[PDB]
Amino acid sequence: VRFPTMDEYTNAREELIGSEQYLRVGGSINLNNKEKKLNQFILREKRAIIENSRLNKTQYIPAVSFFLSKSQMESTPIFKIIKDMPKGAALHLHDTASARIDWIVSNATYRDHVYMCMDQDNFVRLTVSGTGPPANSGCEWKLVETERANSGDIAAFDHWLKSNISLLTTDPLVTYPSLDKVWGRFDKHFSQLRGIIYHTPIRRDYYRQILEEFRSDNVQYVEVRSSLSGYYDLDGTVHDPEYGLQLYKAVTEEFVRTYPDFSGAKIIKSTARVKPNTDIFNDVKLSMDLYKRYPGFFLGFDLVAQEDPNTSLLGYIDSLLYPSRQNPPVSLPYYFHAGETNWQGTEVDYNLVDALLLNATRIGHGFALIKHPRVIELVKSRGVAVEVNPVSNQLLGLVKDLRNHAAAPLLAQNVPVVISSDDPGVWEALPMSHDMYVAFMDLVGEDAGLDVLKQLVWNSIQYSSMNATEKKTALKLLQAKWNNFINDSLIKWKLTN
Amino acid sequence: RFPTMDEYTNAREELIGSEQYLRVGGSINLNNKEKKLNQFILREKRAIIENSRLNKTQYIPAVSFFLSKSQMESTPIFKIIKDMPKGAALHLHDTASARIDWIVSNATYRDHVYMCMDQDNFVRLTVSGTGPPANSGCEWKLVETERANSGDIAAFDHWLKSNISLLTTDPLVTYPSLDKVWGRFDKHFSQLRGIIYHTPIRRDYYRQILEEFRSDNVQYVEVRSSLSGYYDLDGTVHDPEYGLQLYKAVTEEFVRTYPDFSGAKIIKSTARVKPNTDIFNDVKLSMDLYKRYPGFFLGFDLVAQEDPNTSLLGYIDSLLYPSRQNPPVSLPYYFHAGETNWQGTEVDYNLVDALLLNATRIGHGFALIKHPRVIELVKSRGVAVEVNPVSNQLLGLVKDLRNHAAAPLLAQNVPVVISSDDPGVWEALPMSHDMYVAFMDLVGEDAGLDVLKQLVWNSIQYSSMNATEKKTALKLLQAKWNNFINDSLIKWKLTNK
């Protein structure tokens, strides 16, 4: 008889469950006594919310649309703890989508020579023109200063601007109830801001706001996708990508010199995957040059924009292989968005295969990865971190209930993962705290606590592209931040005995 | 590494080919006729996927069954799957596996059938041969009278159907949460409980299960049944052994009539809301029926909603009782387990106990992909997972069926059988709708006839037939399969490649 007694049964059961706990993300962490006190409180809070949903038969709010869950999570102890927690790094961000829309309204649209119009789809668009109103090509441009002053209600005018630009004004899952409907709205958001946010002094100040906001959410380091290209002055001068990179380099240096508690930033060049291969070839050659001449600030290349209907990595393969085929070879690093799809066995999810054959340093999203066991092997063996952006994946149509997020089985296998926010400005998320909350509450289990948070945070520095000296310094800084957070949390939540 | 495109293509195809060989059906070698049919299926599959992807419209096979049912039935892939022999349906409930239309057109035209509207405004049906039923909570009326007085009998019969089916409206819209749709699902069983437990109706309904499944080219079924409490017009209530004997006689006569049909076996089910002392008695009952009806009575299962009710651990001394006897008794178990979006809770840990208790198959296993060690045990022991895709969508585990958690199981060749669960409740066919959505949503664009053939063979090879019965059933299946291949080549004009 295998289990003659309860003790024989529970011994076997606990060993099996415990063996899976050791295998998941953070499973090898041993919390010290202070960490255990905070962990016990977190786990009591997590069990309370889950058991109420389960036994009282009501929806699990951490997993519903961010439009509904945002205000609810923010009043809770687990959220407040994650808010205070050092996040380490945000490794997957876009430079025109990572600061507050409120700043675009309150700062950028109060500058001289800013114009607005309503397009044929009934969305506001903003731009800058130093030579009077722009040509009225399908849009009647009006000076924002004049429109605001004549609105009859300035605060309502500014609120309307924000409401017309944000994807969280209504619930995207209701208003745009399909992948291509919500991607139409997402694409529209960037068209709305494209004019104003590519004006050079506004772009410079918006990037600085990214750094300020991320530091304020206790993020010490960022790596940012940027097109780098087309920043324009009041007189119409258009700058080249190298200038855009130098501009970001100077903003970053000033910021780190001001704030020694912040590790810094590095940049990935991005190009939209709607362009012809001749354009991508030029951008790959550009990236080769910037990688050689700006090492340790310029990281490499990525292809962005909607993955399902547009060009595959294989569609660009001659350009993407070109650096490795040079004599001598040049190893241009790649950070491909890849597998951001519900499709299986198609050209889209097979981008994951090409991303690994091209030696990607990290993979963006990887939502389809759990359907690809041989790709998982390569991701684990090579230490290619998957950048998991849970709010983005829900709002942009990959999943509804976040407990169905395809990264949960990756985390259970200890696939290397970093959490990031992607485009937090677009849908009014915080730099990291909202995404870290949904990952913690939806993508791991009821009995997964502070060890999971600690591992994800450390992962974001370990799988950053900092060099050895930078990374050693950043990890010492993170450890100091972590110790302060543990001590502060015990006092705040009255857990010291 | 890739000086030319040939070397790049070879590594790409090696990796992709490795995954195709690993997944369900990857080792099958199709003969030349099967290859012709496979080529047409794959051409059809790519055409629908490419249209959704490139023309940016929703992928109908993956939307609510309420929307997709009428759309899929006109397509060649569905028609091929309809003609295809399915082998076996291994996960079925005996009060939910024949048409509601038969309940209306046959059962409610029998003498002594009564109806009432309950406090939630749903029709309930029952039989009373000893006067009208007592008006406890609702006012019972003779259906014969209500129908004759309706002034539109067609509309009256259609109203009965509409008031009982869960597909009258889209359950994802009308009952938009787990516990709302489970409320509706529970209500369905209450609506029919009285009438479907009347012995002659219960006998004839079970016969209709076999007729309908045979008509959908299913040759064998294993069915969950409570067995107990069938009642006569004079009020006699029968015991579980009588119920089992009734089904056995129906099955034997059905197989006599239709030698092209392999037959049926029965699993005793009990709802997991009862006290442990009652489950103990049902285990003892099952031990006795297993001993005295070997080869017709299979074992035991716990059913009803998994999340808010009793866990397997909550019954563990009852479930361990057979193994603890002197000499031990191995009562086979078929647990519904892991039918949940929860992780790290008592609900998904039912999967651990199902393995420790030596379950022969696991029902649903939706949470299994979150449990890497349980996956390896399921694979090494050959414990088939009964995957019920329409059920899991309608009953609230997933919205887009491409996020179904069995897709990553199939990609690793976890042993899986497709079944329909409760096809009569929501107007599905015995197997063809579930096999279509499995084929279109749970495997990839490049997965063809080999996946279908493997799933069909799996349903016999992981059935509870003994080895001799399996050989006989596979001979019959092979003959059906060969006829299906030849017929399909003629029907779809494929004979000349």
Ligand SMILES: OC[C@H]1O[C@@H](n2cnc3c2N=CNC[C@H]3O)C[C@@H]1O
């Ligand atoms: O100007 C920014 C560019 O980046 C795209 N972009 C911004 N966020 C994402 C993008 N692209 C792909 N996947 C979804 C998400 O991760 C939009 C635009 O082309």
Ligand SMILES: OC[C@H]1O[C@@H](n2cnc3c2N=CNC[C@H]3O)C[C@@H]1O
């Ligand atoms: O009388 C039939 C019983 O079976 C349950 N039942 C029927 N179908 C299912 C059930 N239980 C659990 N999971 C969903 C699905 O697989 C309902 C009722 O208690």
Ligand SMILES: *[C@@H]1O[C@H](CO)[C@@H](O)[C@H](O)[C@H]1NC(C)=O
């Ligand atoms: C269910 O809700 C009630 C209040 O409505 C509360 O008393 C009880 O604790 C809840 N149960 C759980 C397990 O949260």
Ligand SMILES: *[C@@H]1O[C@H](CO)[C@@H](O)[C@H](O)[C@H]1NC(C)=O
């Ligand atoms: C906008 O930001 C700039 C740069 O930080 C600052 O100088 C300017 O005063 C701001 N505008 C307003 C209205 O605060």
Ligand SMILES: *[C@@H]1O[C@H](CO)[C@@H](O)[C@H](O)[C@H]1NC(C)=O
């Ligand atoms: C944007 O503003 C216009 C004009 O007020 C309004 O009609 C439209 O609904 C708004 N769109 C969104 C998405 O808020």
Ligand SMILES: *[C@@H]1O[C@H](CO)[C@@H](O)[C@H](O)[C@H]1NC(C)=O
């Ligand atoms: C990828 O990296 C491997 C290991 O360093 C190297 O040998 C190979 O040439 C690289 N391939 C490409 C295409 O860059």
Ligand SMILES: *[C@@H]1O[C@H](CO)[C@@H](O)[C@H](O)[C@H]1NC(C)=O
């Ligand atoms: C998209 O639709 C058009 C007709 O509207 C059709 O001709 C075309 O082939 C479709 N594209 C695909 C890839 O199916």
Ligand SMILES: *[C@@H]1O[C@H](CO)[C@@H](O)[C@H](O)[C@H]1NC(C)=O
């Ligand atoms: C109902 O089924 C029974 C048994 O199969 C049959 O005798 C009877 O004719 C049927 N009733 C109707 C109305 O078809």
Ligand SMILES: *[C@@H]1O[C@H](CO)[C@@H](O)[C@H](O)[C@H]1NC(C)=O
């Ligand atoms: C059932 O019938 C009643 C009475 O006609 C009707 O009001 C109710 O909406 C129906 N319910 C469903 C779920 O169809």
Ligand SMILES: *[C@@H]1O[C@H](CO)[C@@H](O)[C@H](O)[C@H]1NC(C)=O
């Ligand atoms: C499970 O099966 C194994 C192998 O047949 C057997 O040794 C063991 O006793 C069984 N365990 C239980 C709990 O029935």
Ligand SMILES: [Zn+2]
């Ligand atoms: Zn992105």
Ligand SMILES: [Zn+2]
């Ligand atoms: Zn079931």
